[PDB]
Enzyme design. Structure first.
Site, PDB file in Angstrom:
ATOM      1  N   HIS A 161      -5.286   0.755  -0.985  1.00  0.00           N
ATOM      2  CA  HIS A 161      -4.238   1.570  -0.429  1.00  0.00           C
ATOM      3  C   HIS A 161      -3.842   2.710  -1.327  1.00  0.00           C
ATOM      4  CE1 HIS A 161      -0.897   0.248  -2.968  1.00  0.00           C
ATOM      5  NE2 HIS A 161      -1.397  -0.969  -2.844  1.00  0.00           N
TER       6      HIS A 161
ATOM      7  N   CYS B  68      -3.989  -5.468  -5.675  1.00  0.00           N
ATOM      8  CA  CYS B  68      -4.491  -4.411  -4.820  1.00  0.00           C
ATOM      9  C   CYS B  68      -5.292  -3.374  -5.569  1.00  0.00           C
ATOM     10  CB  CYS B  68      -3.370  -3.749  -4.035  1.00  0.00           C
ATOM     11  SG  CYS B  68      -2.655  -4.753  -2.687  1.00  0.00           S
TER      12      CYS B  68
END
Length: 350
Positions: free
Chosen positions: A279, A297
């Site tokens: 992301h 992440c």
């Protein structure tokens, strides 16, 4: 000779399964009348062959019904009439299958066939035998269960681009154990598209995207810090979002705790059920390509995250290497390829 009637069910049968049609056949004569009705007297739809020899039901038959079949055969040598009454299976519970990926979808080379039941399956073998997978070009694969509700089917290696995959989940009328029967059949068909494999190497802090073996994008990244590292191994791409609030409670970790978070992010591509996404991370662009700062992440720049959203699709592959973490679990949800083929092929139907 006197005509002979032969039905697919016997008079007085019980537990008759509704996974197949009911039929009647005449020999030494033809069928002059065939009717089937339920316990309320309502007719069941059926069709007699043109030659007059074979009648079959043509609609789905019901659970927990008592049906009555009446047939007459006529021939040069005489007439025979039979009446047969039988009871279909009476389930204790029903379970509905849900298949992924979507019908008519084009998916990456990592996409497993997924059949997820809405209840626990007592007889995993009965479930596997009821699922027919067709591949073209044909390739060997096998079933493996991720948990009590979900079974997966894949080949030894990543799919060949251009392969058609047909999945027929023929569970209606099938006893999946302890009197849990299938609620319905389900069918999907998909196709494998181009080969796309993205590699995040913790030695370089670069996420390199290859499309049919060529490098097309090199993305500086910041992965999980040492206390909350990103696991190494093979991840299958799942869903994508233009924006999403990532809530650590979704993945087991309370927000208010030391490793919890609630964070609104843009251009998010999900790669593990444990909550790893690629992301957009405008706050960490300084660290990306240099240092790991996240909860797990793969943080990239806004344009790189958008590029990933636009060019990577469900079933494409991300491989993480050289991090200080362990290996992603084979049963994560999107970790299927981390299971060695010998183990996968053996299965776990029990």
């Amino acid at each position: 000779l006197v005509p002979k009637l032969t039905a697919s069910v016997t008079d007085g049968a019980v537990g008759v399964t509704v996974d197949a049609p009911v039929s009647v056949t005449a020999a030494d004569g033809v069928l002059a009348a065939v009717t089937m009705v339920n316990d309320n007297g309502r007719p069941v739809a059926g069709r007699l062959s043109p030659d007059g020899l074979r009648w079959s039901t043509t609609e789905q038959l019901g659970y927990n019904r008592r049906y009555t079949l009446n047939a007459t055969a006529l021939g040069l040598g005489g007439a025979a009439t039979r009446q047969l009454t039988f009871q279909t299976s009476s389930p204790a519970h029903l379970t509905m299958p849900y298949v992924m990926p979507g019908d008519g979808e084009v998916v990456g080379v990592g996409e497993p066939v997924a059949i997820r039941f809405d209840e626990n399956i007592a007889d995993r073998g009965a479930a596997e035998k009821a699922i027919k997978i067709t591949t073209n070009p044909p390739v060997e694969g096998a079933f493996y269960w991720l948990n009590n509700r979900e079974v997966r089917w894949r080949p030894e290696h990543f799919w060949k681009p251009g392969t058609a995959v047909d999945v027929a989940v023929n569970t209606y009328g099938v006893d999946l154990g302890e009197g849990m029967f299938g609620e319905d059949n389900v069918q999907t068909h998909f196709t494998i598209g181009d080969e796309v494999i993205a590699t995040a190497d913790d030695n370089t802090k670069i996420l390199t995207v290859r499309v049919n073996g060529e490098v097309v994008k090199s993305m500086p990244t910041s992965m999980g810090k040492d206390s909350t590292p990103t696991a190494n191994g093979i991840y299958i791409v799942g869903s994508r979002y233009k924006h999403i609030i990532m809530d650590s409670s979704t993945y087991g970790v309370p927000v208010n705790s030391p490793n919890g978070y609630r964070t609104d992010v843009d251009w998010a591509t999900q790669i593990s059920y444990s909550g790893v996404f690629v992301h957009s991370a405008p706050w960490s662009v300084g660290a990306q390509g240099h240092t790991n700062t996240s909860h797990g992440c793969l943080n990239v720049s806004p344009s790189n995250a958008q590029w990933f959203y636009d060019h990577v699709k469900r079933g494409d592959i991300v491989e993480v290497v050289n991090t200080v973490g362990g290996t992603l679990p084979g049963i994560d949800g999107l970790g299927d390829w981390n299971i060695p083929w010998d183990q996968w092929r053996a299965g776990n139907a029990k």
